[PDB]
Tab-separated table of C-alpha atoms in Angstrom:
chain	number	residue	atom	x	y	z
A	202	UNK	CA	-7.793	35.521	15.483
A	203	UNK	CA	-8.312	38.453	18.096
A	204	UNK	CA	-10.674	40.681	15.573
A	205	UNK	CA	-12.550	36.504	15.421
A	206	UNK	CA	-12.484	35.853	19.151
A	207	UNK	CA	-13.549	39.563	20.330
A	208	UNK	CA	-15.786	40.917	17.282
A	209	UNK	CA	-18.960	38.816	16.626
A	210	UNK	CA	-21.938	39.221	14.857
A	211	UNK	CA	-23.870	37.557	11.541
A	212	UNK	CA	-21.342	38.884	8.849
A	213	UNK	CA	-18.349	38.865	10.945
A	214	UNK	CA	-18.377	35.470	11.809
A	215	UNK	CA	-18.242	34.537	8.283
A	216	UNK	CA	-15.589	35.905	5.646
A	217	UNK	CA	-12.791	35.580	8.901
A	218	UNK	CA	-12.634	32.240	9.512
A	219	UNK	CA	-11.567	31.246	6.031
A	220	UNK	CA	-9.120	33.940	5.784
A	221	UNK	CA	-7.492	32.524	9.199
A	222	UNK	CA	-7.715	28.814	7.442
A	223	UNK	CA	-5.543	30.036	4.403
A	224	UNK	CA	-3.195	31.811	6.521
A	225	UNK	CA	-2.907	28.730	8.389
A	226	UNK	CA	-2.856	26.618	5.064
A	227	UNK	CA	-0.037	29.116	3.795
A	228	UNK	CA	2.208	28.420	6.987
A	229	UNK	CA	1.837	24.905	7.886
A	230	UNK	CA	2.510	24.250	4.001
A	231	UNK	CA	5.731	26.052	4.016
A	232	UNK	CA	4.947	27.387	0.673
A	233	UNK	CA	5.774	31.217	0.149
A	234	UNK	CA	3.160	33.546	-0.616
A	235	UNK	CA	5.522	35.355	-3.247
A	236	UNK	CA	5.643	31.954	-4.942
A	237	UNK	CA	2.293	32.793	-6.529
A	238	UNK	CA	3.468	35.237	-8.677
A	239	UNK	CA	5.659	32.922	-10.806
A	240	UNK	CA	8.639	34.534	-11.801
A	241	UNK	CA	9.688	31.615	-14.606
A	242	UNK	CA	7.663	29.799	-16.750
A	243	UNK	CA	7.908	26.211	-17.400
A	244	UNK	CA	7.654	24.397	-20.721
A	245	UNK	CA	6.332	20.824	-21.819
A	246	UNK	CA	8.534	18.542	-23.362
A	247	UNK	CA	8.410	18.545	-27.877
A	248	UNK	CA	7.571	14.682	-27.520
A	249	UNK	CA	3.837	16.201	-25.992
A	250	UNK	CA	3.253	17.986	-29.030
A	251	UNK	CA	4.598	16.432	-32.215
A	252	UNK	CA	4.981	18.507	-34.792
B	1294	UNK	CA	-3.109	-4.041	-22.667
B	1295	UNK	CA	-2.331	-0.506	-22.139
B	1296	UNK	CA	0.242	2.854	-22.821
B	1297	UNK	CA	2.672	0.861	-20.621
B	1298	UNK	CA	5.017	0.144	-22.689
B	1299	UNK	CA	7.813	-1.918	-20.604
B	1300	UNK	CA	4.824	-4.330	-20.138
B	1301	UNK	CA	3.880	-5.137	-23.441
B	1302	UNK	CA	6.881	-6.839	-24.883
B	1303	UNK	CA	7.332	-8.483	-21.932
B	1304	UNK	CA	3.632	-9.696	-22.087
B	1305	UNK	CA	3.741	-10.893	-25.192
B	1306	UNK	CA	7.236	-12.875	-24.541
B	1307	UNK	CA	5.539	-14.089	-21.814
B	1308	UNK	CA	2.892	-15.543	-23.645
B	1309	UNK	CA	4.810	-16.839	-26.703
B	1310	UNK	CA	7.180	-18.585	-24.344
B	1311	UNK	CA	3.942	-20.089	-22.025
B	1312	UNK	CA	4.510	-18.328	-18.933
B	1313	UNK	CA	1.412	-15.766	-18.202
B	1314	UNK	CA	2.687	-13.357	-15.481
B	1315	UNK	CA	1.993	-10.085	-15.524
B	1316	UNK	CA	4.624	-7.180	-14.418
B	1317	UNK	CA	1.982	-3.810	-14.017
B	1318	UNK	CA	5.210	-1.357	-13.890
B	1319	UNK	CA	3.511	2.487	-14.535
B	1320	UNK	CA	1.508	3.547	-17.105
B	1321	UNK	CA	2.506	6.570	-19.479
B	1322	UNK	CA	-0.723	8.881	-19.544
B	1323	UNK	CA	-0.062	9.601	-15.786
B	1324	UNK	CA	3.763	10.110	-16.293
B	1325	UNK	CA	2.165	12.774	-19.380
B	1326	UNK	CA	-0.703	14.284	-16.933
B	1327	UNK	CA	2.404	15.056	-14.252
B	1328	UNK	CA	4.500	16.728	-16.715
B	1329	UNK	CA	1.337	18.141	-18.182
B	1330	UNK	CA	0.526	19.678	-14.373
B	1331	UNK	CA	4.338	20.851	-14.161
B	1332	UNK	CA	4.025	22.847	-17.294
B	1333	UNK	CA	2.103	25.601	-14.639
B	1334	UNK	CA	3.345	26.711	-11.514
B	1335	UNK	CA	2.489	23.868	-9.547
B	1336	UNK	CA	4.999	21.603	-7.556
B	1337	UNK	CA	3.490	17.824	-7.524
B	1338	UNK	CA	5.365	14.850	-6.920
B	1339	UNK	CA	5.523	11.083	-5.598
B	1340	UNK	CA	6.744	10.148	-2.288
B	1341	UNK	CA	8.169	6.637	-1.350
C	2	UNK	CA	-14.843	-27.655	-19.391
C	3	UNK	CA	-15.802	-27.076	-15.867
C	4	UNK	CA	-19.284	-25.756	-16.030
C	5	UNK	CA	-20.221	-23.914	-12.278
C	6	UNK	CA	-17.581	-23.757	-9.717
C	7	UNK	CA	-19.614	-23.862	-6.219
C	8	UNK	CA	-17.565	-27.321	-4.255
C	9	UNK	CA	-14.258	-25.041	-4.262
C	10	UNK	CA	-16.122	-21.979	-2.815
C	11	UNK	CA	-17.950	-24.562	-0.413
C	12	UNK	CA	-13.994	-25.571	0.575
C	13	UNK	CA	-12.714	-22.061	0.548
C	14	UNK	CA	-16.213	-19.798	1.523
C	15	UNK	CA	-14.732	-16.255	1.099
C	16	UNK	CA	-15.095	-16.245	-2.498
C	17	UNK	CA	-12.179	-14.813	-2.908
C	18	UNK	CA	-8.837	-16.570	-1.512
C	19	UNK	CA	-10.141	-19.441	-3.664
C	20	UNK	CA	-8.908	-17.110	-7.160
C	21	UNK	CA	-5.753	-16.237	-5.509
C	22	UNK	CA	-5.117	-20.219	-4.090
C	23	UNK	CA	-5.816	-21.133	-8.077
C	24	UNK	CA	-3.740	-18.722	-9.238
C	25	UNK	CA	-0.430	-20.095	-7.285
C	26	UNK	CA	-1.504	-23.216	-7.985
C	27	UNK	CA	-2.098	-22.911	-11.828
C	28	UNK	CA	1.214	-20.527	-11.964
C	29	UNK	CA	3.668	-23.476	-10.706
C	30	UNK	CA	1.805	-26.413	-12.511
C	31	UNK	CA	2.622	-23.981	-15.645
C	32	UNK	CA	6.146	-23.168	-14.287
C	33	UNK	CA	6.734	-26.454	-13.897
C	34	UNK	CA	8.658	-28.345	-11.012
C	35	UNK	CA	5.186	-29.899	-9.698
C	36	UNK	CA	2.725	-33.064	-10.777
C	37	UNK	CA	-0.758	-32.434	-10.690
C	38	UNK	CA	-2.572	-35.009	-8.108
C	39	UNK	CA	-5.683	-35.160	-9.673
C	40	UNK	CA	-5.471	-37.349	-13.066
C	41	UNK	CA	-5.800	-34.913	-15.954
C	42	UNK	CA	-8.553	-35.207	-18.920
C	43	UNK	CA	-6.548	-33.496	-21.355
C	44	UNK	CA	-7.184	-29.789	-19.825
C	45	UNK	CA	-4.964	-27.071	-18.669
C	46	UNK	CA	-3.425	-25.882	-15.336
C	47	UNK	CA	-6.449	-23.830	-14.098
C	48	UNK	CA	-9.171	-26.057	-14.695
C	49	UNK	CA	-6.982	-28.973	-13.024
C	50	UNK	CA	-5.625	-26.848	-10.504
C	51	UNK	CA	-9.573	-25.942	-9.605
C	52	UNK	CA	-10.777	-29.222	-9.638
C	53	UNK	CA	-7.896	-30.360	-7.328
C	54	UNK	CA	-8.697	-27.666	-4.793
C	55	UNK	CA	-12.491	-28.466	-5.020
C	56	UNK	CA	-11.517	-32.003	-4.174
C	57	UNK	CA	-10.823	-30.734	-1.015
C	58	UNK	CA	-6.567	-31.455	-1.449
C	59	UNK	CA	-5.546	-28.332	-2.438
C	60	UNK	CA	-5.704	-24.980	-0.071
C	61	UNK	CA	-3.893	-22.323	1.301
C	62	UNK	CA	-2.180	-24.561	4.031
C	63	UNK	CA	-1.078	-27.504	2.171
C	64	UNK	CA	0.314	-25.486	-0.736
C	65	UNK	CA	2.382	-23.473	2.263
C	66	UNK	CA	3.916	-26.783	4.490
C	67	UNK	CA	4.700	-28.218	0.947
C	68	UNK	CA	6.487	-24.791	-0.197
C	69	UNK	CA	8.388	-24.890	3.551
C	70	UNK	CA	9.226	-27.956	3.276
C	71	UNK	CA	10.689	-27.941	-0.324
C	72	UNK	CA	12.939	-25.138	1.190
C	73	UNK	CA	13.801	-26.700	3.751
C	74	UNK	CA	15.071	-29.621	1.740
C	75	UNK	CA	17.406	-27.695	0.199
D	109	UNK	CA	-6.816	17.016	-31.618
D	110	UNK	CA	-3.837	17.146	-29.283
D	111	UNK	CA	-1.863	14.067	-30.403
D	112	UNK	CA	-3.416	13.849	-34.219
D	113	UNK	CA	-3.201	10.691	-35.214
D	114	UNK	CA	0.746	9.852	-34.218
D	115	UNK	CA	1.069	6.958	-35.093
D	116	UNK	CA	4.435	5.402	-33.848
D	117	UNK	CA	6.364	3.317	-36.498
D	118	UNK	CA	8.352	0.366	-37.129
D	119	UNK	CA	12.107	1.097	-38.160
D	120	UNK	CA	13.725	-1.667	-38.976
D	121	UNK	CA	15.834	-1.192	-36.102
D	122	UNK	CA	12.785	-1.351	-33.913
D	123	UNK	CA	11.920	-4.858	-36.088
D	124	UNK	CA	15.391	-6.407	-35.368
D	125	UNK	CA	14.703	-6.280	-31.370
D	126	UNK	CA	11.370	-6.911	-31.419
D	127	UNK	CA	12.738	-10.532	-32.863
D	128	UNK	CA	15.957	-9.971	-30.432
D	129	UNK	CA	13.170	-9.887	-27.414
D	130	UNK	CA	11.487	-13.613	-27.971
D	131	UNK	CA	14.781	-14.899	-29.416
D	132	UNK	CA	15.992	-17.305	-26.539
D	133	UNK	CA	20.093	-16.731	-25.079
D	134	UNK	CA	21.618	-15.293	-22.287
D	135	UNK	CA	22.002	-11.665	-20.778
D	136	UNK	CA	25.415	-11.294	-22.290
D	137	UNK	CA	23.864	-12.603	-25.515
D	138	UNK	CA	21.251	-9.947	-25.294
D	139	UNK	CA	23.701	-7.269	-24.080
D	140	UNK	CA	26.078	-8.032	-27.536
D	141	UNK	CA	22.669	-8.391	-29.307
D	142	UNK	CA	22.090	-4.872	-28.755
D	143	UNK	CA	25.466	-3.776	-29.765
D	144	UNK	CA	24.966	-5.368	-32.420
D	145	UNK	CA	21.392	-4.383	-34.007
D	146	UNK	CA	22.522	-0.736	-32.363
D	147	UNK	CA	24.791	-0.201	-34.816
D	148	UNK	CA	22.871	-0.959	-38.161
D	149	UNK	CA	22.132	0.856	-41.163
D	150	UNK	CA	19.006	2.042	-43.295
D	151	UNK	CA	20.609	-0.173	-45.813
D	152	UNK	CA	21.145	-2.969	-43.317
D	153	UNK	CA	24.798	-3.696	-43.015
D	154	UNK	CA	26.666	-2.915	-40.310
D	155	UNK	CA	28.389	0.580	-39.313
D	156	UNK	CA	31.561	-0.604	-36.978
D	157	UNK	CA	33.765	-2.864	-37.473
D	158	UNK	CA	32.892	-6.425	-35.343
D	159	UNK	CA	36.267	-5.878	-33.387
């Protein structure tokens, strides 16, 4: 927000603002960033693919 | 007409026995497409 | 049969509460418990019930003081 | 072709309550109902003994 509100220019006001918006999405949301990297992997039930 | 299948019996009971209501209940395919968006790491669920 | 429905719209107008006044009309008549005011022609409970609200008899007022009033009774 | 052709099937079981369903009684005659037709054989006859 500071390098957005003090730095300005043609490039710099692009590529910042949607970095702030999923920082923003990432707290609001409560939703870890480590949660990304899955750490176990979920399966579909045997009745979704019959043998 | 439909994957729902707690409607269709009672559709058809309805209609042998004259009475042509219609309970709408939850169809299957989306109870398949959430488990089939579960499979990947991606919480999704219905509120009340 | 009934051919073109246009008197009930012309008693109901929105096009639309008319189906839904039919439809809890036709349901009890079917249901039984009720006696349909206009004289049938050997037809069922929607084309009856629609030709009773076109005669201007049926509506979504009536049908509502008659329910209230059956409860009432009780 | 994810689901084939799989084609659900009838069962004999699944025949009896299909039949139990527009037969007309109670909801303690379709609660023993499906005690009943539960607990039936390939064959036909019944597994447990009616007491």
């Amino acid at each position: 927000r500071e390098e957005l509100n003090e730095t300005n220019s043609e490039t710099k006001r692009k590529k910042l603002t949607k970095r702030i918006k999923l920082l923003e999405a990432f707290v609001q949301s409560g939703n870890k960033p480590e949660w990304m990297i899955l750490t176990v992997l979920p399966v579909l039930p045997p009745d979704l693919r019959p043998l | 007409k439909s994957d729902d299948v707690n409607g269709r019996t009672k559709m058809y009971k309805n209609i042998v026995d004259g009475n042509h209501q219609m309970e709408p209940g939850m169809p299957e395919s989306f109870n398949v497409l959430l488990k089939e968006i579960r499979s990947l790491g991606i919480n999704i669920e219905l509120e009340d | 049969a009934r051919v073109t429905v246009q008197d009930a719209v012309e008693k109901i107008g929105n096009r639309f509460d008319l189906v839904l006044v039919a439809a809890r009309r036709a349901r009890q008549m079917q249901v039984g418990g009720k006696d349909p005011l206009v004289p049938e022609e050997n037809d069922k409970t929607t084309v009856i019930a629609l030709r009773e609200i076109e005669e201007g008899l049926i509506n979504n007022q009536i049908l509502d003081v008659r329910e209230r009033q059956e409860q009432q009774e009780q | 072709l994810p689901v084939y052709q799989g084609e659900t099937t009838q069962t004999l079981q699944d025949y009896l309550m299909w039949q139990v369903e527009l037969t007309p009684f109670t909801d303690t005659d379709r609660a023993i109902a499906t005690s009943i037709v539960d607990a039936v054989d390939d064959t036909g006859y019944l597994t447990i003994q009616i007491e």
